[PDB]
Amino acid sequence: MKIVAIGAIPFSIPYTAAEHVLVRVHTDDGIVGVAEAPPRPFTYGETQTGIVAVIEQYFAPALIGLTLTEREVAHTRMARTVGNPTAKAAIDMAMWDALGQSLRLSVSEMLGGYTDRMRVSHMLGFDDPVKMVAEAERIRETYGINTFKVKVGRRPVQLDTAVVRALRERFGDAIELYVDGNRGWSAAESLRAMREMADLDLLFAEELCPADDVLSRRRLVGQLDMPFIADESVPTPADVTREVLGGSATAISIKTARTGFTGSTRVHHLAEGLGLDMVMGNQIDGQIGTACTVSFGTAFERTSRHAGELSNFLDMSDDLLTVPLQISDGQLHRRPGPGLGIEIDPDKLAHYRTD
């Protein structure tokens, strides 16, 4: 189980576009672990070109020679390089995939195996209330999804509060609802919006305003009833500690795209120890990334007690798996096979790769 090579292949798939990087960890046993790295310059500052570069130029040469059971050595070596979250996460998850295949165990069970499935949430917004209601009905009827996260951040705030209210009026208590502003509103606008929706039983408020508007962010978080999920502002455990102790976050988003499995376990244990809720998020992941999210989320009780953002891949026109993921009865099961339980379709990769 020694790493003999690590590759990074850029690929592009149009949306109904995902310009991700397929990361592959090759072992001396002929096993190949895989994962994807989604470049999000507006969240982490990584680019597709940059991810391939850091992996080929820095991470690959630093990890070749290590066994699949020296994860902490790999973790420590990669940690020397600052940032480049998805690049590091992809390598970690590909290593875990390879390990699982080598031991004939799923990543989920190796991580803890608490359960075998997660409830799925769907995100929507930035359109008319009538259209949003129509989409929610379609998604719920088609996939059984009962949890919806409304993307907000428009001005006037009434444009978004109208969407959330329309959804609650249509489904009543039959669905779960919460919001994510992606730092789009000011703290003051965020408070006015939440106050207007005080009767809609929103379970969480996610990154309504910039965490970097430090003092106003802290004031807002202290004014809200529900937990305030920090996402882009807590990419590392140290950020979790600073934002939580500082009062700018009262809940934590865990995204395997940025913290993989080794790092995500560090985030889960920190959040559990501190006593904070956690939710599995989506980095606008393809099916490879989604398979990773469910692999981790199902391993623990604290992550599986909440729905996970696992439906974004449906918006892609195609994907790289030989067997596509399926959402039924509003849930997604962790794959039955060893490792991530997935396989890359050779023809799909050949058709979508851009190198």
Find residue 11's DSSP bridge partners.
20, 353
Q: Choose the catalytic residue: 46, 97, 176, 231.
A: 231
Contacts to Mg ion from residues 268-297, by CB under 5 A? none
Residue given tokens 């609802």 in the structure block: 177
Amino acid sitting at position 288 = I
Number of shown-chain residues binding its own copies (CB under 8 A): 29
Q: Applying CB under 8 A, which of residues 2, 13, 58, 226 lies at the interface with its own copies?
A: 58
Pair 268, 278: CB distance under 8 Å: yes
On whether 180 is known to bind a ligand per the annotation, the reply is yes
**Is there binding between residue 180 and Mg ion (CB under 5 A)?**
yes
Give the CA distances from residue 52 to residues 95, 101, 201, 338, in Å, rounded to whole numbers and listed in that order. Answer: 17, 25, 43, 27
Q: Element (H or E) spanning 148, and its range?
A: strand 147-151
Closest CA to 355 of 130, 6, 21, 18: 21
CB nearer to Mg ion: give 63 or 280: 280
Out of 76, 158, 241, 322, the residue judged to bind its own copies by CB under 8 A: 241
* Dist CA 254 CA 124 (whole Å): 20
Tell me: does residue 72 bind its own copies (CB under 8 A).
no
88 is catalytic: no
**Should residue 142 be labelled a site residue for its own copies when binding is judged by CB under 8 A?**
no
Instruction: Report if residue 82 touches its own copies, rule: CB under 8 A.
Output: yes
Q: Are 62 and 78 spatial neighbours (Cβ–Cβ below 8 Å)?
A: yes
**Of 189 and 232, which has the nearer Cβ to its own copies?**
232
Q: Is 131 a catalytic residue?
A: no
Q: Which residue, among 121, 106, 149, has the nearest Cα to 296 in the 3D structure? A: 106
**CA 296/CA 287 separation, integer angstroms:** 14
Choose the one of its own copies, Mg ion, none that binds residue 180, judging by a C-beta under 5 to 8 angstroms depending on kind.
Mg ion
φ and ψ at residue 277, rounded to 5 degrees: -70, 155
The one catalytic residue in 97, 160, 180, 207 is: 180
Report in angstroms how near the CB of residue 189 gets to Mg ion at its nearest: 18
Residue with tokens 């396989």: 343
Q: Does 62 interact with its own copies (rule: CB under 8 A)?
A: no
**Cα separation values, 295 from 108, 145, 303, 310, 340, Å:** 5, 19, 11, 11, 7
> Between residue 36 and residue 55, which ones bind its own copies under the rule CB under 8 A?
41-45, 47, 49-50, 53-54
Query: Is 231 part of the annotated catalytic residue set?
Result: yes
CB of 76 to its own copies, least distance (A): 13
- Residues annotated as catalytic (active site), given as ranges: 151, 180, 206, 231, 255, 283
Q: Which residues bind its own copies (CB under 8 A)?
A: 41-45, 47, 49-50, 53-54, 57-58, 80-84, 211-212, 214-215, 232, 236-238, 241-242, 245-246
Q: Which residues bind Mg ion (CB under 5 A)?
A: 180, 231
